[PDB]
DNA sequence: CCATGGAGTCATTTTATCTTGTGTCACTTACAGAAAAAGTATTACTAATATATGTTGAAAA
């Protein structure tokens, strides 16, 4: 880094031969450092919590027999997730859990989320939930895609038996590999298909090991095991090659995972479909959910369970929702012609029975849609490519999660190619995203076509206009069946008699604490 | 102690053996013993003599 | 590496500081048996004997 | 005015204490809990999907 004060030399050799330890450059001869001086031999809220995280960290660390390495690897991840304050209010285990998890995931080792929970009584969902959430609140790479080819190692460890298993290992490995190739690996919980491979190669090596004995380490269901098994029995060249020579046949034949096979069971140019549309409407006035709960055909009210009232209808088969403050959510609407229509109709009970409750602030909170491309999709490389915009977790849920910001919609993906799409307030955004991503679909295929026009049907505001936007037009759009959806006074007398009949314990402690309000000053 | 942090918070009915935490809690007996026999500093507080 | 990693790497983990260990001795010697193995915590372990 | 009693000062021991103890290589390995704040998990809804899971049981051998 320094320079010879004479030759202006750019490179130095230390000289360790004669125990001078010189430092001199080939073109100068002038030293630079002679005499190589060489050495020898509290209370904070955040830092304390970091120490505690170390302790709960070490604790769970060796318990799974993980590297001393990977722990201090993941401890940093905890320190990172603290910055976005994701870790503040959620059960500490679920945090330290995934924070420890993604690390040994990136290193590509054998550890497993289902395996990871049983340190607790908890569900391999709560942990999975928190995990997948800290995937949102951080931004994480694609790399942690596990295969059975890793897990079959450690699963083989507790199988007892003898040296033959190593043989079985290679017997299993190339098996599972072809199984990944034969195309009926995708979208499944890996540990299961791993155990299936082990049962196969073990039987291939002619031993007797029971299914229970397999799932003990495999941590899957017997039924699942033999279901994935019998799924293997009918596969390509399964019968013909099942004898000796192991497999020298790498030939794939055809590829037919049960995903679209069931599409045959019930058996661009295809338009995405509208399942449901969620909206909101404000009535501008607060009412008594108890009082409204008295006369309705579709009602249920249990603040002990949920603080609001159920509202529904038979046609156009919509639920929506109602609040206490006088606002509401809109559900069950397959289109907009049904929504503002129904949205107004649910106010006809009220303006017929309850308060003034006009129709205000009507906006779609979300739109649901789904469709199918009618051909298989390989997700394992999809996210491995697009996981910047995508995520794929075999364990939780079968399909792939896709994140599109432009426009902003999450795309739910499967093996068969059936695609569910929502997280959109606008019908056009659907065909936008579906359109733009469909070339990615055509990109990943194994061996309609024409988008036609990007926008065909009328816009959303057209169908919003097909229903009266004026908050005071109701009796005109009243189905006249809601005139029959009012129950008589006696049905409210004895029906309320039943409601309070069961609710006198809930309102009991309710009004009792209302008395404790007096007890406050005392 | 580690048996208690289960039993502070009455989460449903708490049993779930509480056992499998022992592996979590182990190697104080192993690593503590290795480090001892390798280094050769025996810390005995029970006799208060090291 | 010893620095604080982040969820950002475009390409390089690359740059290396090579710190080879040298045999400083008064007399020439020979390398005979050189072992490659890995300890229980799974990290590369190299042991050579002169 | 004088012998006395009482105390005040002043040597004198004997107890309580601390610094040391030949040199050189050659490796070696601040407590805990309390309260406030932040944030979240249910707690309902469709609504599509596709595994797991259990059971069971029905149906077949
Ligand atoms: Zn120089």
UniProtKB/Swiss-Prot annotation, chain A:
Keywords: Activator, Metal-binding, Nucleus, Phosphoprotein, Repeat, Transcription, Transcription regulation, Zinc, Zinc-finger. It holds the Pfam family BRF1. Zn(2+) binds at residues 4, 7, 25, 28. GO terms for cellular component: nucleoplasm; nucleus; transcription factor TFIIIB complex; transcription preinitiation complex. It is found in: Nucleus. Sequence repeats lie at residues 60-136, 155-234. The keyword ATP-binding does not apply. The keyword Nucleus applies. Present with 4330 molecules/cell in log phase SD medium. Belongs to the TFIIB family. TFIIIB comprises the TATA-binding protein (TBP), the B-related factor (BRF) and the B' component (TFC5). This is Transcription factor IIIB 70 kDa subunit. The gene is BRF1.
UniProtKB/Swiss-Prot annotation, chain B:
It is found in: Nucleus. It comes from the Eukaryota. DNA-dependent RNA polymerase catalyzes the transcription of DNA into RNA using the four ribonucleoside triphosphates as substrates. Second largest core component of RNA polymerase III which synthesizes small RNAs, such as 5S rRNA and tRNAs. Proposed to contribute to the polymerase catalytic activity and forms the polymerase active center together with the largest subunit. Pol III is composed of mobile elements and RPC2 is part of the core element with the central large cleft and probably a clamp element that moves to open and close the cleft. Component of the RNA polymerase III (Pol III) complex consisting of 17 subunits. Present with 1950 molecules/cell in log phase SD medium. Belongs to the RNA polymerase beta chain family. This is DNA-directed RNA polymerase III subunit RPC2.
Swiss-Prot record, chain C:
Signal peptide: none annotated. Present with 1950 molecules/cell in log phase SD medium. Belongs to the RNA polymerase beta chain family. It comes from the Eukaryota. It is found in: Nucleus. DNA-dependent RNA polymerase catalyzes the transcription of DNA into RNA using the four ribonucleoside triphosphates as substrates. Second largest core component of RNA polymerase III which synthesizes small RNAs, such as 5S rRNA and tRNAs. Proposed to contribute to the polymerase catalytic activity and forms the polymerase active center together with the largest subunit. Pol III is composed of mobile elements and RPC2 is part of the core element with the central large cleft and probably a clamp element that moves to open and close the cleft. Component of the RNA polymerase III (Pol III) complex consisting of 17 subunits. It comes from Saccharomyces cerevisiae (strain ATCC 204508 / S288c). This is DNA-directed RNA polymerase III subunit RPC2. Transmembrane segments: none annotated. The chain holds residues 851 to 900 of 1149 of the full protein.
């Amino acid at each position: 880094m320094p320079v010879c004060k004479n030759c202006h030399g750019t490179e130095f050799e230390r000289d360790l031969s004669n125990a001078n330890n010189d430092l001199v450059c080939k073109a100068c001869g002038v030293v630079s450092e002679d005499n190589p001086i060489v050495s020898e031999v509290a209370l904070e809220s955040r830092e304390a919590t970091l120490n505690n995280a170390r302790r709960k960290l070490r604790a769970v660390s060796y318990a799974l027999h993980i590297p001393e390495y990977i722990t201090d690897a993941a401890f940093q991840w905890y320190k990172l997730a603290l910055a976005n304050n994701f870790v503040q209010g959620r059960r500490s285990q679920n945090v330290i859990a995934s924070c420890l998890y993604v690390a040994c995931r990136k290193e590509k080792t054998h550890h497993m989320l289902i395996d990871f929970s049983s340190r607790l009584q908890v569900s391999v969902y709560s942990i999975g939930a928190t995990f997948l959430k800290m995937v949102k609140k951080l931004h994480i790479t694609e790399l942690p895609l596990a295969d059975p080819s890793l897990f079959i190692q450690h699963f083989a460890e507790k199988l007892d038996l003898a040296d033959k298993k190593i043989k079985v290992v290679k017997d299993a490995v190339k098996l599972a590999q072809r199984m990944s190739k034969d195309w009926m690996f995708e979208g499944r919980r890996p540990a299961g298909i791993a155990g299936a491979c082990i049962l196969l190669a073990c039987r291939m090596n002619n031993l007797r090991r029971t299914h229970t004995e397999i799932v003990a380490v495999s941590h899957v269901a017997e039924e699942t095991l033999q279901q994935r098994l019998n799924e293997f029995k009918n596969t390509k060249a399964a019968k013909l090659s099942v004898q000796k020579f192991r497999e020298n046949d790498v030939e794939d034949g055809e590829a037919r995972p049960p995903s679209f096979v069931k599409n045959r069971k019930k058996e661009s140019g295809i338009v995405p479909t509208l399942q449901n549309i969620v909206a909101t409407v404000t009535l501008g006035c607060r009412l008594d959910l108890k009082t409204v709960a008295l006369h309705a055909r579709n009602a249920e009210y249990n603040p002990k369970r949920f603080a609001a009232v159920i509202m529904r209808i038979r046609e156009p088969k919509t639920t929506a929702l109602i609040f206490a403050s006088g606002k509401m959510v809109v559900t069950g609407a397959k289109s907009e012609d049904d929504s503002k229509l129904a949205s107004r109709k649910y106010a006809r009970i009220i303006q017929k029975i309850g308060f003034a409750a006009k129709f205000t602030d009507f906006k779609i909170q979300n739109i649901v849609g789904s469709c199918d491309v009618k051909f298989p999709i390989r997700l394992e490389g999809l996210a491995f490519s697009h996981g910047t915009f995508s995520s794929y977790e075999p364990e939780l849920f079968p399909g792939l999660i896709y994140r599109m910001v432009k426009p902003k919609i999450v795309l739910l993906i499967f093996v068969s190619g059936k695609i569910v799409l929502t997280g959109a307030k606008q019908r056009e955004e659907i065909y936008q995203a579906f359109e733009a991503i469909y070339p990615v679909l055509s990109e990943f295929r194994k061996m309609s076509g024409s988008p036609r026009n990007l926008h065909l049907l009328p816009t959303t505001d057209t169908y919003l206009s097909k229903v009266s936007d004026d908050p005071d037009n109701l009796e005109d759009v009243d189905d006249e069946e809601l005139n029959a959806h009012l129950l008589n006074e006696e049905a409210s007398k004895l029906k309320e008699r039943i409601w309070i009949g069961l609710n006198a314990d809930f309102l009991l402690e309710q009004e009792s604490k209302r008395l404790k309000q007096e007890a406050d000053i005392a | 102690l580690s048996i208690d942090k289960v039993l502070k918070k009455p989460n449903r009915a708490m049993e779930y053996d509480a056992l499998l935490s022992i592996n979590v809690h182990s190697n104080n007996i192993t690593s503590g013993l290795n480090r001892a026999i390798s280094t050769g500093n025996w810390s005995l507080k029970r006799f208060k003599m090291e | 590496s010893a620095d604080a990693p982040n969820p950002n790497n475009v390409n390089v983990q690359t740059q290396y500081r090579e710190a080879p260990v040298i045999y400083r001795g008064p007399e020439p010697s020979h390398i005979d048996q050189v072992m490659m193995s890995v300890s229980d915590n799974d990290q590369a372990l190299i042991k050579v004997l002169l």
